[PDB]
Amino acid sequence: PSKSAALHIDLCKATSPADALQYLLQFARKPVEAESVEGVVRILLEHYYKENDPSVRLKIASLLGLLSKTAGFSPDCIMDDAINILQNEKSHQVLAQLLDTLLAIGTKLPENQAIQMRLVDVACKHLTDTSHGVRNKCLQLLGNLGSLEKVQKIIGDYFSDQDPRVRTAAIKAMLQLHERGLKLHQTIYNQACKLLSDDYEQVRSAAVQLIWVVSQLYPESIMVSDGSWVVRVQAAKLLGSMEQVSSHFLEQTLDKKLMSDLRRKRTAHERAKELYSGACGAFVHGLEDEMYEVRIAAVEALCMLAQSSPSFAEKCLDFLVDMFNDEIEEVRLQSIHTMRKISNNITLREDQLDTVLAVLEDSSRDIREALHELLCCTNVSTKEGIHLALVELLKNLTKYPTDRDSIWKCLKFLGSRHPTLVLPLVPELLSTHPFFDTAEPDMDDPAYIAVLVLIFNAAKTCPTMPALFSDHTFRHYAYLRDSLSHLVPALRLPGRKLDPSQQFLQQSLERVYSLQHLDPQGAQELLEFTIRDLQRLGELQSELAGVADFSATYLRCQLLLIKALQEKLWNVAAPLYLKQSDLASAAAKQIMEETYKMEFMYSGVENKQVVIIHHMRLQAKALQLIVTARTTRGLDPLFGMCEKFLQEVDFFQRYFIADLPHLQDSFVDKLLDLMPRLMTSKPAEVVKILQTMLRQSAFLHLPLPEQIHKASATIIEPAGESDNPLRFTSGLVVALDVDATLEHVQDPQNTVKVQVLYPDGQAQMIHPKPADFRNPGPGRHRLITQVYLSHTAWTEACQVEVRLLLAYNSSARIPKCPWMEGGEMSP
């Protein structure tokens, strides 16, 4: 019926170009068909195409092509489009639109043989034009239609066409044929020569890619394609100042072209200006020429060719080091990366000062860790470089003590890499005297612990390490080794010396499950004891803490339920409900929140856990209904909430179809079997039957899994500290703060909120920013987002509260992290 409305709208006004274009814009920008009646709409649109207003015809063809992409490209529509395009070659854009429709109807759904991809290609090839009519279109037509694994003569003779903008379509079509195999011949390379000198743009940037792919296909059937196309690529990339787009693509292509034989005669001479067949540069002249978008590709090709070939590094490390004074925040990190990726079989004697000074010129918060990781994996030739790196790290520590962990880790790696280079420097690092033994340094000094851990890490394979130690060094090692083991290793100093949780959890769960037919007080105290035991186990055990907390929360839910069912209100008069007589009026909300937390906070949940928690939520809703009806005086509102509860029950039983015959004697199945009868009486007796049934219904068993909790940390970013009253005013914002990290949050993007609880009644919840969510530690996350704070003057420095929360489908919040107060910041 979607075509009838379009036909009526097209035949109502029937204007020259107003009604048709309006209907096309209304039908194209609307929703798709998503049904089987798309063929009728396509036929109705094509029936009115043979008319005037060629622009409206092209618009209708484009709309039909866009609509046929929703799994509606049948054989009949393709045949109709082919029959229409056979005589619709009147306008220039009409043929292009028809070819695009044929491509969308034949190269998107069929993608097969037997007149599905070969007939359309032949029809497009036989539909040539006179002057830029369909060439740029039929090229990509025949590109997206692969005949068979055997059609190259057409592009071969068209490579010398008139309009240079058609060569682009030809080359993209030939690349589309390449990325599907098709057994590309070696003769194209000869034609590729005529593509090197084109005197145009947007062609050489693809010509370098063409020569790269034809050289990387196979270096046979010809010197012998060994280090031959690399010379042409370098000659084309040497003119980097003439085009900022054709130079980066050339370097990106050479990055993979360097995987060839890579003859030394054509590789060693490239790193110099004067060539020693290669007669070009583009290595020492392609760096300081233009913007850095090509420098990045150049150093990428450099590291790509240095990773494969073990040689060539000793003559390019100088060039890779001297390119640091580039005053660009991008080239510096890329240099760190390309040096870290080549940190093997390299030396460093005097080129360290040009690569280490990247930490003093600015802060570089995100580059400092990369520089520290670089400095630790590399090798040092002499002890002078070791001493320079050590004093520089001590300077960075005394100037920035906020990243001491990275410094300790890099010093550990440096000591584990080469421990011999520090042996002639042991009595020079720590202040020692041959006949005094005085001037004991501070214990908690962050300047001496680094040297201590470096010496301890270099003390692994040293023959006689304690021969030069002091008196307190032995006790310092004894204290550091027993306190931490991830930085201080084990030594051989003469002064020094040298599944129960799972089965217990299973026993506790089977005890809770089996022992259930007893007195209510006994069951209550058993549940309390098991909850306490599970909480203690979760506080003690670490890797088995998630499932333990899950079981503890489920048992707390069950305990609160069984305590609500044993309330004194049912033992006293019902229609009175004075006050503080039913502890379930405030317990139903707690049970709902507990179910929400158990469902959304944990990650490793199973469908059995989902249906069990949904049954628990339904039981909580039934309890809330009972508590509300026990005190509700008006009989009219009772119908509303009872119909709502029956609607929720119907929605639950409709969403959950399987695993219903699995659960036996449960509240859900009993209500499903009894509900055909409860829909004929008064809500009073309905809720009465609901109450007398829920008393001894069942206790469903929950299956354990490998789930984990979703908690945060208390990083020092605006954490608890001294007063530190900042200076600000009442008008504008006070200041900005940084949040903490996250752990096991299951894609915290668009899921974690940031709540700000002011001392006033107002509370602001800033939405998260998806651009700052970092995930380099999968399984652990980090949230660095700026929070905005502003309020009127306070006349004091009382307190402030910032916190993290969670998000739900409609609306809900979950307290994950401990309540961390922020800075005073008195305005």
Binding site: P17, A18, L21, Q22, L24, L25, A28, R29, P31, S55, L58, K59, S62, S91, H92, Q93, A96, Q97, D100, S131, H132, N136, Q162, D163, P164, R165, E201, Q202, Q244, V245, E293, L726, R727, F728, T729, G731, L732, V733, V734, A735, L736, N750, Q762, Q764, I766, H767, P768, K769, P770, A771, Y788, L789, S790
Partner: protein
């Protein structure tokens, strides 16, 4: 076989998104979205107070369209975008750019559907546009609330139910965000283009900038083929003359004269409006509190800056400093400092520390000018507000002007004077109408006033001038003509009208190069022969002289018999008819009849005499 036809998808009068096609050029003019449209939604602000949160409930259980005085949407402003559907972006090669204004919707058509080609523009406009998109995305991403307005866009059967001014605009494809990816991955494609360059795109068509004087880089690109004068106009001014004023030494025999930018305010006076604004700022700094002027980033605000600097010699005493709140304020200042070649010839660009455009802003910076290009903890040194604050903003919903308006919302102490007239009265101040401010709307804008375009059309003497919108009718709430004069006929454009007004029939290219041939003689048309094997290379068929013409002309019988006798023939008998002549030659029995535009020869079996007579009769006419 096609012609030039502008396919415009917009109905904005200030901006334009026209696309002037051609036979093989396929050029497209500047493309811009609707900037003043995202204002009906709630303003984007940080530190949400309680006054702009609790308001009237929605109508008919919507819970997503609040109402406080007028209709509003508590969601993302949901930036508008033109249709751009009935033209595919796969056959586009280049997109034109305007004076640092027509790139708000540029990244939306670069890495979304097509446009894999190149782009040509100048440096100051592209840099100012980069700073504009940077400050725009900076004002958007702060407190990035999720989109909760994807329900009232569809089912337009009930969209006409709410109050007017909300259902007047439709929703086709709105993106609302930039994700900081296409905006910075699409800017690394621009080429260095100056003024009156010879880029020669597609080897056939040439574009020549004009550099009209409206702002820093108000260039009017003129796309032209071998014989064509398609002229596109973005912005011009004939009163400021500071940034290289417009010159009319090239657009003489123009063809279409696409005029886009207009003033829209013909009753106001620039000098008068600046004078009344100065009087207002003086009277509000004499008594009351601070002053707030919500303005745009670098650009048009520089004349106001110069006026307030030169106003220091008036009744307004000292201790009235200027705050400038913008994340790209320092970058804009240094760019205005570095950009000085695009000024006037000798009036402004003197280079002797007398640029008169940006150097005067730094000359008075040492007396009382604190920049502070941020708001995050920078005013802790002194807070009394005896000053005037200018906050850059794309509209009245994104910039930091809403936080300051909620700060000192009390009336009779501050001003809300605007500077950009691309807004309204009841809708711009719709969430802030429960106030008592003066609400002055001094329209600082000078864009081709109606008194200037008139004399421009008089001195140009144009033809077939296209009108951008349907404003040929008198505007509402006005009593005047305010129309354009056209001799031939006034055209019309709309949202989807692809009218065809052009006819380039390959006028004259001829790819003339190394043409050497003979030349005959005639009265006034010395015709000659031609050569085959053109061997075209790139939009040029250089038909050089290297490796069948028809006949025409009457042959006289008198000269025929004379040349027959003096070549060697004899015994030739000629007679006359009613209109023709019959000549008989006794050798080979040759009978030839010559009538008016007719000749017929009959002879027997002979080859040499046949070819001899052929070459004898063929050299008596001119070859065409």
């Amino acid at each position: 076989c096609l012609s030039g036809h502008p396919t415009l998808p917009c109905n904005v009068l200030k901006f334009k998104s026209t696309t002037i096609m051609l036979d093989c050029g396929l050029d497209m003019t500047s493309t811009l979205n609707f900037l003043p449209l995202p204002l009906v939604q709630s303003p984007r602000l940080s530190n949400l107070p309680g006054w702009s949160l609790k308001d009237g409930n929605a109508f008919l259980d919507k819970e997503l369209k609040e109402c406080s005085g007028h209709v509003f949407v508590d969601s993302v402003p949901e930036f508008c975008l033109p249709e751009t559907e009935l033209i595919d972006l796969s056959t586009v090669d280049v997109i034109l750019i305007s004076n640092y204004h027509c790139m708000m919707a540029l990244p939306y058509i670069t890495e979304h559907t097509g446009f894999t080609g190149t782009v040509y523009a100048t440096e100051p406009t592209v840099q100012i546009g980069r700073l504009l998109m940077e400050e725009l995305v900076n004002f958007i991403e702060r407190v990035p609330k999720a989109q909760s307005a994807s329900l009232w866009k569809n089912k337009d059967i009930q969209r006409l139910l709410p109050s007017p001014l909300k259902d007047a605009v439709e929703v086709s494809t709105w993106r609302r965000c930039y994700t900081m990816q296409e905006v910075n991955s699409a800017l690394s494609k621009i080429q260095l283009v100056g003024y009156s360059q010879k880029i020669e795109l597609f080897g056939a068509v040439q574009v020549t900038p004009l550099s009209s004087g409206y702002a820093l880089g108000s260039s009017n690109w003129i796309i032209q083929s071998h014989y064509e004068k398609v002229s596109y106009v973005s912005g011009s001014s004939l009163l400021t003359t500071h940034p290289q004023p417009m010159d009319q030494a090239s657009l003489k025999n123009s063809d279409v004269l696409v005029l886009t930018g207009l003033t829209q305010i013909p009753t106001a006076n620039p000098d008068g409006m600046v004078g009344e604004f100065c009087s207002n700022l003086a009277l509000t700094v004499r008594n009351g509190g601070n002053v707030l002027v919500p303005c745009y980033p670098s650009g048009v605000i520089y004349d106001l800056l110069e006026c307030l600097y030169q106003y220091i010699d008036s009744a307004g005493l000292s201790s009235v400093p200027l705050y400038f709140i913008s994340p790209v304020a320092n970058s804009s200042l240094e760019f205005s400092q570095i950009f000085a070649e695009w000024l006037c010839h000798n009036k402004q660009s003197k280079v002797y520390l007398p640029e008169p455009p940006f150097p005067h802003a730094e000359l008075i910076q040492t007396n009382k000018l604190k920049h502070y290009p941020s708001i995050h903890g920078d005013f802790s040194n002194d807070f009394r507000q005896p000053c005037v604050v200018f906050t850059g903003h794309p509209s009245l919903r994104f910039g930091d002007v809403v936080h300051f308006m909620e700060l000192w919302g009390k009336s009779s102490l501050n001003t809300v004077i605007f500077t950009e007239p691309d807004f309204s009265y009841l809708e711009a101040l719709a969430p802030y109408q429960p106030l008592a401010m003066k609400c002055i709307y001094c329209p600082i804008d000078t864009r081709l006033n109606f008194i200037q375009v008139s004399k421009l059309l008089k001195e140009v003497q144009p033809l077939h001038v296209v009108c951008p919108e349907q404003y040929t009718q008198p505007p509402p709430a006005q009593s005047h003509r305010m129309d354009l004069m056209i001799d031939c006929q006034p055209p019309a454009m709309s949202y989807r009208r692809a009218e065809v007004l052009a006819l380039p029939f390959k006028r004259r290219y001829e790819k003339i190069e190394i043409m050497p041939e003979l030349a005959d003689s005639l009265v006034p048309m010395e015709i000659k022969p031609g050569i085959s094997l053109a061997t075209v290379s790139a939009v040029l068929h250089t038909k050089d002289n290297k490796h069948k013409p028809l006949l025409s002309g009457s042959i006289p019988v008198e000269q025929f018999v004379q040349t027959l006798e003096k070549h060697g023939f004899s015994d030739i008998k000629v007679e006359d008819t009613a209109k023709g002549h019959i000549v008989l030659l006794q050798e080979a029995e040759t009978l030839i009849q010559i009538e008016e535009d007719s000749t017929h020869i009959i002879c027997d079996n002979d080859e040499m005499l046949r070819v001899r007579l052929r070459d004898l009769v063929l050299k008596f006419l001119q070859k065409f």
